Amino acid sequence: GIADGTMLIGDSVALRANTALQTALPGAQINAQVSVTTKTANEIMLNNSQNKFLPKTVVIATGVNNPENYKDDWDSIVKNLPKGHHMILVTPYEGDKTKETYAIVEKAAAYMRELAEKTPYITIADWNQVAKEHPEIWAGTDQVHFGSESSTIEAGAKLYADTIATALQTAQDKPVKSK
Ligand code: NA
């Protein structure tokens, strides 16, 4: 019964790609904010479900903020996805390999890949993998917020939006969570 549509619940990285996301996904509902974590995205997801605002396809674009609890957080948000939805997980990317949290973000991305592989109503959008392939969008940056000027911000934002668009196309023929 859940009506068609896409809502993205995302973090500052997603918020940085706001215009590119909307351009690549016309009519998608982009709900991205600076401090969003996987924890609060879980709460936002259910709040929207319980008010019947959550459409069929849910994009969770979080993971780089507060990565330490990734196991429980991604287990939980996957568990709490309401019946009737398909879910897309956007893997996080921390580019500074010396960051004390780099290995955690990497573990989080890997664990999200495991959940998407495992779960029929879940699809991966592997920003982590794509981000590693494009060093040019990280020159002069904090290694998380793509682009040091307009051209690489735009190029980075378009790569980010296209990754999610490709996952949505992949998820088109795939089932929803049911019972
Ligand atoms: Na899957």
Residue numbers in the entry: 427 to 605
Give the original sentences from the paper that presented this experimental model.
One such target is the enzyme O-acetyltransferase A (OatA). This extracellular enzyme modifies the essential bacterial cell wall component peptidoglycan and thereby makes it resistant to the lytic action of lysozyme, our first line of defense against invading pathogens. It uses a catalytic triad of Ser-His-Asp to transfer acetyl groups specifically to the C-6 hydroxyl group of muramoyl residues within peptidoglycan.
SpOatAC treated with this reagent lacked detectable catalytic activity and X-ray crystallographic analysis of a native crystal soaked with MSF revealed the formation of a covalent adduct to Ser438 (described further below). To confirm the identification of the catalytic nucleophile and gain further insight into the enzyme’s mechanism of action, we determined the structure of MSF-inactivated SpOatAC (SpOatAC-MeS) at 2.1 Å resolution following modification of the native enzyme in cyrstallo with MSF. The most significant structural change involved the side chain of Asn491.
